[PDB]
A paper describes a structure:
Glycoside hydrolase family 71 (GH71) includes α-1,3-glucan degrading enzymes which could be exploited for biotechnological applications; however, the family is presently poorly understood. To increase our understanding of GH71, we have performed a phylogenetic analysis of the family and detailed biochemical analysis of two of the five GH71 enzymes encoded by Aspergillus nidulans (AnGH71B and -C). We present the first structure of a GH71 protein, AnGH71C, including structures with carbohydrate ligands.
Complexes of AnGH71C with glucose and nigerotriose/nigerotetraose were obtained by soaking crystals with ligand and clearly revealed the binding cleft within the N-terminal (β/α)8-barrel domain. The two protein molecules of the glucose-soaked crystals each contain two glucose molecules located in the same position in the binding cleft, while each of the four protein molecules of the nigerotetraose-soaked crystals contain distinct combinations of nigerotriose and nigerotetraose occupying different subsites within the cleft. Crystals of the apo protein and glucose-soaked crystals were of the C121 space group with similar unit cell dimensions and contained 2 molecules in the asymmetric unit, while the nigerotetraose soak was determined in P1 containing 4 molecules in the asymmetric unit. Only small protein structural changes are observed upon ligand binding in AnGH71C with the most significant being the packing of the loop between β6 and α6 over the substrate along the +1 to +3 sites leading to interactions with Gly193 and Asn194.
Residue numbers in the entry: 35 to 431
Write the structure that this text describes.
Amino acid sequence: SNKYVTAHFMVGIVENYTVDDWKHDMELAKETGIDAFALNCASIDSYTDKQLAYAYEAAEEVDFKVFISFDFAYWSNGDTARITSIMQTYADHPGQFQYNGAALVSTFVGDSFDWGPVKRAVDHPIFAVPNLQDPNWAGHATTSIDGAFSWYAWPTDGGNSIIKGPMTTIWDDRFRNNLKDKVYMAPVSPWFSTHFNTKNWVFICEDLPHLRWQQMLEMQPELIEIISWNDYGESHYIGPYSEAHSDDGSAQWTKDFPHDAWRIIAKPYIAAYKAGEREPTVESDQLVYWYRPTPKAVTCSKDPLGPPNGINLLEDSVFVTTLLTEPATLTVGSGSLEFSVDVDAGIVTNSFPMGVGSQAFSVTRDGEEILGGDGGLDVQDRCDYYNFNVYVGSFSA
Ligand SMILES: OC[C@H]1O[C@H](O)[C@H](O)[C@@H](O)[C@@H]1O
Ligand SMILES: OC[C@H]1O[C@H](O)[C@H](O)[C@@H](O)[C@@H]1O
């Protein structure tokens, strides 16, 4: 009956992590109210066993928890013996995240992997919540599951066209209807932008870094997984940009693009979600802002990859989430443009037309500025490469 929030962590990019690197990520996750990392890992990485051992040790040492996400883009159904041996190592580890007295285990893809032989070979109870693609098959799953994890974190109609938002709960409600008694782990992602030779698209997210958390308070799923802590290559990271991870080419659009301020939004929503509350509690005045580096129609000078699929559906907007103890007035300067809007107490998002140039934010109450400053990135009217990630920043009273 207790509710918990987890975050997807890419073990595949941390070959060179130390225990101290893991501890740093875990401390930041704890400060946000996250309960555990899903350690997404691959059979093909020679460093998987080493880094799982470091993560479980770090979690035990800093009062955090972890569980394994077997990434079945790499793991295979023929790996049952190795998966079993890993669960024999970790299901009863004090740092292993437990749900209802059983060790949580999950996947990326891997719908066809049968958990029966694993569960029946491990003495400690296991709670299997794999990533499943079809809500209806989740209803009659043959693989000995205890719940399902959805990857439908972004607007989609089920096909391969990119569709406009705003995000809806249509897929969440389909999973929940089919799961009945079983548990549902809902995905929470702030953004999506990827730009590789093998994957080059955006999803239409916009106000998603706030809106999705509001949906979580409405929906009250049994578990949440944040997509993601550190998948720089898909731009949905809410964790820090770690110096020790291995760059895959995503540094091009991520190294200068902090996302840490999105944790300011997540923190009160996580507390409210765990408490069963329908609205967050604001403890101090804060502001979180985000925006892309250029207007969407700018043509690049030299990108060997074309523009990402879907960009025409984006808006040229600056997004601002205010976290307010009392009503106030929000003023935004975006290039030569200036806007203002009265905002209620609570957590509210407003979008503003993007202008090229410097960005400025200010919140005033009773004719006095309570917070404000300059955006950390000037919006530009040209680019070498297409970057549809966002810069995120904050101001706190
Ligand atoms: O974790 C599996 C694989 O994930 C990603 O493709 C990484 O770029 C690669 O280095 C890793 O082997
Ligand atoms: O829907 C987003 C997902 O699309 C594809 O399945 C990609 O393989 C995966 O990496 C991405 O997260």
